[PDB]
Paper text:
This enzyme catalyses the conversion of N-formyl-L-kynurenine (NFK) into formate and L-kynurenine. Our attention was drawn to the prokaryotic KFase KynB (EC 3.5.1.9). The KynB subunit, approximate mass 23 kDa, comprises just over 200 residues with about 50% in 12 β-strands and 15% in four α-helices.
Highly ordered structures of BaKynB and a complex with 2-aminoacetophenone at resolutions of 1.9 and 2.3 Å resulted and confirmed the binuclear Zn2+ environment. The enzyme active site is a narrow cavity approximately 7 Å×12 Å and 10 Å in depth, lined by hydrophobic walls composed of Trp20, His60 and Leu158 from one subunit, and Val40 and Val42 from the partner. The water/hydroxide co-ordinates with the other cation and acts as a bridge for the binuclear site. These are His50, His54, Asp56 and the bridging water/hydroxide.
Residue numbers in the entry:
A (entry chain C), B (entry chain D): 4 to 209
The structure:
């Protein structure tokens, strides 16, 4: 079975958090100019497109990207539909059979426009974290830019998730994939000091 | 079996090519400033650390990163030792068992210092490409910054490899891994317009 891309295309039209570094890929020096190669430059916010958060993003004493365990970001994953819900917590996830699940992707289908930043999204409620952690879930992914409300300064979901050893993947693209079981790859770059990393998230049906 | 990291750590001390953008990770907004999060800004040449080249790097009409087939960058890989050789071509690879191999990583052990740019490296000779392609090899990886000599402006190996449908992975770290068969992951970011991408390359022993 083929790997399926669930990442947002990265280009100058992609949205960012309000005021954050705009995405920029540019050819600084062309093959015609250099006589051999197109020399590029990439400038971006960490939290652009499909990406993972490190605890340092919301906790000054939290792990940086390179400290994160790579095993978390590769392996069996379950994908479920949680569309048409203002927020997702224990109550909403109790209806799913999640025994033995290690990684969980949530399709909210709430936004899905990579080149616009949403005004509101469905967030995850804090009680989701003990619930998921008890099941053995080590990674949660969402198809929106955040696990907390866009205007929230407390970031209760970010904090509680990492308190329970649950890692965070944001802006996956899931409208073209069915619910069910897959193998996931969503590896951070080896960034020694960073608060997160863009990733190429892909999945393969089991 | 656990995944093993074969990527170079990315930080402000990493080496770059002569003439390339220096690597920069900075915290744009501190948690003190934003009131909630540390937000990072990443500026880099795509040919920094462990990365893949897109044909657009050396051919104006070549594919950009997002156009590359993701299947090439995930799957069975063989790792072999080609240390203490000034250059590697058909002659040097004939002695290896490579039947059915799809992806090949070459340990030159020539450099291995991510924070220094080498003065000389072992390059791949152009006759490597028809040889590897005939065996079905779709990806070649090296533990140095280039498949061509550092001062070479023609980039014969880059061109010939692509001419034979062989993709290119550079700056893997292989000094801590044994020869043999593994599963490789080395996925480019979903960069619409780029000449290459940093990757998180990891391997798992069969
Ligand atoms: Mg020229
Ligand atoms: Mg603390
Ligand atoms: Zn984020
Ligand atoms: Zn986040
Ligand atoms: Zn390169
Ligand atoms: Zn190259």
């Amino acid at each position: 079975s083929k790997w399926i891309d669930i990442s947002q295309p990265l280009n100058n039209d992609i949205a960012t958090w309000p005021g954050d570094t705009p995405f920029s890929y540019e050819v600084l020096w062309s093959k015609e100019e250099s006589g051999s190669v197109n020399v590029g430059k990439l400038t971006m916010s960490i939290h652009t497109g499909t990406h993972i958060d490190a605890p340092f993003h919301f906790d000054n004493d939290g792990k940086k990207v390179l400290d994160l365990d790579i095993q978390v970001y590769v392996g069996p994953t379950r994908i479920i539909d949680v569309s048409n819900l203002e927020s997702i917590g224990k109550k909403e996830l109790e209806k799913f059979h999640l025994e033995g699940v290690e990684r969980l992707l949530l399709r909210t289908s709430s936004h899905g426009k990579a080149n616009e930043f949403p005004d509101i999204i469905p967030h995850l409620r804090a009680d989701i974290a003990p619930f998921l952690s008890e099941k053995g879930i080590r990674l949660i992914g969402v198809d929106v830019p955040s696990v907390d409300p866009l205007d929230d300064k407390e970031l209760a979901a970010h904090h509680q998730l990492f308190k329970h050893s649950i890692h965070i993947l944001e802006n996956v693209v899931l409208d073209h994939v069915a619910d069910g079981d897959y193998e996931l790859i969503a590896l951070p770059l080896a960034l020694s000091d960073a608060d997160g990393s863009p990733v190429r998230a892909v999945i393969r049906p089991i």
